C-alpha cells in the first residue's frame, strides 16, 4: 500500500506527434453520403502527445490531470494495461472511479477507496505453465460507501507474453459532460516502430457511465510480473493527450462510417 | 422486500437501496397482498411516469395502534425514537397483517423497538446506539437503575395478539430526486406498430407525423435514428426490434 516499486525509474515526459488520432464518432446520429460540421472535445491533428512506456529498468505510472478531457493509446502485446484510476483526491475522502478488467469481467464501480501510491497487479512463477493470473492486488486497500457497480459480461483474455510487432492496439476517449462519462474505443493492427501510424481511424462507443463525479486526475492500471516493490514491467508503450474543443468536417460514406477528417 | 419472511428491527429498520432499474408499482397496487396501501403526495400512477435517482426502502414490522404514527411531520413512539417520515415526504405507505406469519408463541423476540431517547429523531435518521437514557441527574453508568432506563425493547407479537398489537409488515417507500442523474424509472408501455399508413409515432425521446416503410438503410450498432442534409430526421430504427 505504501511500498514503492524499486525498480520503477522516474524519466522526464518525452512527446511525440500523433496524425489525425483523436477522431470518434460525436453522436448516435447516422449520416451517409454528407459532410457534417459539428464543435466537442478532440485531438487537434499535428499536434504533440507524452510518450509513455514500461520494461523490465524504466518504469512509467504518473498521475496526469483529467481537465475536461483526455485521448488514450496504447500498444499492446501481453495487454499489460489493467483499467485506470479516475478521482479528484484519489483518496477514501471523496467518491473515486475504478474501471479495471481482470480478465473475466469489466469491473466499473464508485466507492471510496484507500489510495495505493503505486497501485498495480503483479503475476508470478511463470516459467513453465505459463500461468499468467492475477495474484496480489496493490489497487485499492478497501472499499465501501458504494454508489455504483457495473460488470461486463463475460470474456476470456489472454494476458500471455509476444514477441516482435505490438498485435494490440486500443485507443479510447475519456471525457465527462453533464455528469455522463463518455468512453470511446477503437481496436485495430497495425505495423509500427515508435511514435504513432500515419492513418485515420473513427472511435466508437463503448459504455455510458450516468455516475456524475468530477474527476480532475487519473492513472493507467499496468500489471507487473516476475520469476511488492522487486517486481518487473514487460515491454509496452502508452500514451496521452488532452482534448480541446476543435471543430472538425466529418466525411461520411455511403455505408454511414466517417472516410476521413478535416481540423478547421 | 415486502414479501420477504423477516425484517431488521425498527430502530434498525434496514434501508434498501433500489437503483438503476425499472419500478413498475401498478402490480404491488393491483396485487391485493395488501392491507391498507395510502400515498403522500403522489399517486402510484404518477410514480410509473417519473423517474427517480434514489429509491430507499424502508421496511420494518411494527404493532397496530403504532402504525397510525407513521405520517410525514408527526410524533410517536416509531416517529420520534424511530423514524420519522419529513414533512416533505412524496412517498407511499403499504402495510400488511403477518400475525400469522412474525409472530410467534410466547411472544417474538427477534424485533425490538426503542422505547427511550435523550432526544428525538430526525426524517431519515437511524439510531443503533444502546446508550442507557438517563432521566435523572444521576451518572447512569452505562446500566439501568434509578432514574436510568434501558432505551432497547422487544415486542410482544403473538398469533393471539389483538388487532392493536399484532404484526404489521410497514414498508415506507422514500423516494428522493437528486441532481445526480435519474436511474429508477416507471415502466413506459408501447404499442403495436403500423406500418405503409400516415400516423403519429413517438420512438423513445423523438415525435413526428409521416409514413413508415422499411428501407435498406443500415445502421451503426450504436446509431437510433438517422438525420438529413438538412438535420431532419428522415429514418428511425425500432427501439424493441431491430
Redesign the interface.
Known sequence: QCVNLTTRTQLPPAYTNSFTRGVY?PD?????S?LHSTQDLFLPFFSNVTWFHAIHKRFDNPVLPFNDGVYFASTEKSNIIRGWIFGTTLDSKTQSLLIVNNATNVVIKVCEFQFCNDPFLDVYYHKNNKSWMKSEFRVYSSANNC??EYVSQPFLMDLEGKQGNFKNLREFVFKNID??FKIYSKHTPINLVRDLPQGFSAL??LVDL?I?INITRFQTLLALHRSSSGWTAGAAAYYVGYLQPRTFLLKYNE???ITDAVDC | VFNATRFASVYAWNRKRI??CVADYSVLYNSASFSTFKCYGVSPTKLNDLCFTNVYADSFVIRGDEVRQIAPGQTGKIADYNYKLPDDFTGCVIAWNSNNLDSKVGGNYNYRYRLFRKSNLKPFERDISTEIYQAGSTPCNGVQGFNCYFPLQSYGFQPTNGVGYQPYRVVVLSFELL???A?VCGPKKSTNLVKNKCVNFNFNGLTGTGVLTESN????P??????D?ADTTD?VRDPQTL
Request: glycine share 12%; no cysteine; charged share 15%.
Open positions: 464518432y448516435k446520429v447516422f449520416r451517409s454528407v454508489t455504483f455528469g455522463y466508437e462507443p450516468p456524475g455505408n454511414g462510417t | 437503483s438503476n441532481h445526480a442523474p436511474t438503410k443500415k445502421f451503426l450504436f446509431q437510433q435514428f438517422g438525420r442534409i429514418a
